Subunit: 298 residues, 4 copies
Amino acid sequence: EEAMEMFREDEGYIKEEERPLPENEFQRQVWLLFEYPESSGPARIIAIVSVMVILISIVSFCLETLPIFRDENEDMHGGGVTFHTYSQSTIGYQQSTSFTDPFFIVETLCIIWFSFEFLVRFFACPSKAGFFTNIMNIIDIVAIIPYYVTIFLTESNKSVLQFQNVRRVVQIFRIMRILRIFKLSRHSKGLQILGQTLKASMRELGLLIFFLFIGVILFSSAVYFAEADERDSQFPSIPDAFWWAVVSMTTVGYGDMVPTTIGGKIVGSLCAIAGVLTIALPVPVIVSNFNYFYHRET
Amino acid sequence: EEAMEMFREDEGYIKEEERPLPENEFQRQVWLLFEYPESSGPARIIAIVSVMVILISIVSFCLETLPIFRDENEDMHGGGVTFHTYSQSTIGYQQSTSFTDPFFIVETLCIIWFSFEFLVRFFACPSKAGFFTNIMNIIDIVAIIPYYVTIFLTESNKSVLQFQNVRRVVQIFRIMRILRIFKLSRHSKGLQILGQTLKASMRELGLLIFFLFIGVILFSSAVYFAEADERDSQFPSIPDAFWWAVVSMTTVGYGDMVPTTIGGKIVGSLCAIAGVLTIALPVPVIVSNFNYFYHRET
Amino acid sequence: EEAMEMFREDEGYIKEEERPLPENEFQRQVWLLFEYPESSGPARIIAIVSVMVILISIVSFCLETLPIFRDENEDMHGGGVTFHTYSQSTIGYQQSTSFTDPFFIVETLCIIWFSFEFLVRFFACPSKAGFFTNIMNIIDIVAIIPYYVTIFLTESNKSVLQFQNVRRVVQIFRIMRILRIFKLSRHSKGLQILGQTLKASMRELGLLIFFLFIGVILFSSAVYFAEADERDSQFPSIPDAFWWAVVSMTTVGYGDMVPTTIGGKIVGSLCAIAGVLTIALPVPVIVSNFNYFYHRET
Amino acid sequence: EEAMEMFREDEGYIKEEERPLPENEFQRQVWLLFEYPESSGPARIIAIVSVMVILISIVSFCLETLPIFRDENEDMHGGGVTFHTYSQSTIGYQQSTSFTDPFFIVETLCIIWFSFEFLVRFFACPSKAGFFTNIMNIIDIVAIIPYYVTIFLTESNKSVLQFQNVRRVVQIFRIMRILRIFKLSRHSKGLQILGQTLKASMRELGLLIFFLFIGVILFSSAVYFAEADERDSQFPSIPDAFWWAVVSMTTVGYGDMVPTTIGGKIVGSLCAIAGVLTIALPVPVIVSNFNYFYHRET
């Protein structure tokens, strides 16, 4: 049994996964209801629920921004900014105990599900200390927080001049809601394969960014000086032209700004070729890993 | 003979195709005239006809939309909308027993060929009940339908206020004519290989769309809030910015809308790289299958 | 010696190249001076000359079009059209026995080299009948012809009303000069490998064009009807939208015309993905051949 | 020991690296402090310093161009040109013994490090003659020079009418500062793998450029004549259209100029496909080498 384990690790057939139960025999049993969808029919249903749950939050998150509805705000004409209208304009919902804001309800509804997932999952974990080394528990935590950041801003604060301390910092938090989408990782097998391919390429991915950081700087400058002697130049500075080379090394290619001089085109056309020769060097490094981690289940 | 068949299936040399005739001995014989082009010279000719047939419909379909001819319509100046002018403007041809509309003739001509293909092929099929599991018979059916839907709209309807019930539903049908192009599958060997490669990738293709659906939502939002505090922003909402990230993860890159702020470019430039790292993960999954299904004839 | 040749052909080590000399013993000897650069120092020199010759013609061809010089034409203001100014405006040079046009000299100089290559190569060929099956002799012929087509229009014609018979047909010929660039094939080893890779892919390349021809039609139509109900639509017809889908299946992506409606974007964004899934299916079919034909010299 | 070395070279396990010390025993000992970071803690620190050094110069180089600061120049309004304001406008810093220009200090500070790297590295080299064959010493030299070219222009010249001799030649030098970024090659292992992959591809890379040079010329001309008979054409000449085909063979795709005629689109759409069939032929030639040179450390 000892030289067989050294054989499979060389082979890579290393599956040491053994889910220990919580030992309560119902603290154990209910734990497996929320750790394994394959134990029963209703065990699937929880996954069937929670996968659908995340989508409901997202559509509710995206529709707040819609100008059928953000133009149907408290500032439907958009004249000033109030302390209570800051929530309708920079938090995207109207907090009220009456809760006439429909989205503010729908936002809140999923959070009740997420904690009752998570907290019940926290109380029934066998491994208590190493709970926060698991990455698929971290996303659970970061999801539920700007909910509470919203409320403590509303409940605790009864004062003036709070926007001069932190107001766009609140607007940062309105983004960071967006990484609730990573909660699908617990359900998709395939999204974890991305999560492992990146985990197995964190140095070779750094070959890409560093080779692009070289490519950006070299050709942003070299086009800036060939487009230098215009009064009418589209390239005012070199950190303007960092936007230009990533538009043209990644071959997206926009048209917002394009070189105009005879030299700036000759410079500009090398950068089109060299972006192929910068992305494609460490891409098949990655994709061979992803192909390997995909069929590694077989 | 028993352990040889288990050998070839492991190998993949599994060709169990055996075309049974219809047994009529002319019901059988004429069936093979319209199932196999290789039985005779004229057996090729039917395929040589029917391949040329489909093209004639397409050019006749596309030229209806041309403003040498849709501007040479009954509303050549475009003032109003009549019940009979709905056919020339939303069905694309003028139905008449005189049939002065030339395209309306040419459209009708191919349909006579298609049924006389199909209906004769229906009566001479050996497999009678399993006729509608064959996908290359489904396209035959979907081709001939909006022809009849056009006529029943003309024949049965003599009444007022029909556009308030279904008029854009008619305009849907004018699209669905377009999938007559898939009828070439019966003739091209290579188009069926695409039909099989997709048939062997319907989960791994779903890795692509789901990894892109992740990529779209994450960066559409993250550019929306870095482009937030403009009165002059090109990004009014987040479902506006779903158009933006598929223009920029697929590296098409249009120029209709591009970020402008300092933050929106830094967000916007990550999304150029990440679209490479989203398409290219399950593409060589597919292309290895297609290369495998191509030479599988050898 | 017989089962060794069957071995190498299976292997692919099939090099039956045996250059028979012209047998004149100076017709033979001068032949190797103009077929093999490796026989001597001066044998290289002709190859060094003729490679430099082609470039001289090209720069002379491209500079005619330059508006430092085509605006310095006989119609420097561009008011009318003369029969003698047709050469300076649609043949790009001024033919005269004085030949004051400098480019018209430089154009003429190279043709003297090409024939004295070719005609001397014609008279000293061992194989006289199969001379015109060799493709690298066809390019020799097609190069020298529109030179003579230029002169016969000048020399033979002294009459009126020739532009109503053929005038843009002359302008066709001014293009077809451009395939003089393929004359480098006799000199580059690498350009012939492209010439062989295409020669070994003429069916599998046809998988690409036909899969793209499917992709173009299916999405040009499907965006035309989602962009139909505008008075302000960017898509007037469907053969307008053939330009649109090759801008967007090949992911070039211009911005001349982009969909605007909610449906036209959803249609338009599928076509971005599907162009990856159309180019990349028969590309590694080709590139595996090119990699094979490249190192086939080793 | 003799047939083992012939074995490893076939294998490619050829590591003949033997760093001979300078033999001074402190000239030797200090040499390893500036050639090997792995000898000690402080040996790392010099590499930790000098990697951070280069970045400081770059940010200082890029920020000079910023119109928070180049508009805060001596010509903050930009009316004329002085002999002393040429440094603030075309050398990017204000040279003085007072040195009130802050960047001109920060520029100067890094050069003191680079020479004290290099000159100390020069005096302690074992190999003195072949010092300038090593490429990672050339980059050291070309870095430090336009610093001195700046000073000798200021120190030696006290005269008039120097701009009519060389003024944009000075502006050339302001670019050539930019290749100080290649100094990271001594530190990154991965950037040298790029440096070796290009060193192992200098003929096969030339397959790419020459196949593109063919592709550019053939389609720039062929679109010029299909877009010829406009008064309103976007393509004035053929070397205008060299910018067009590299925008469209590399599939960047800008929108600055796009064909408009019916023929110019049919020409223009072939060039989209053919740029895929020109980049992708010698790319996996390269990327296989880079993948090989990456893991060649293992």
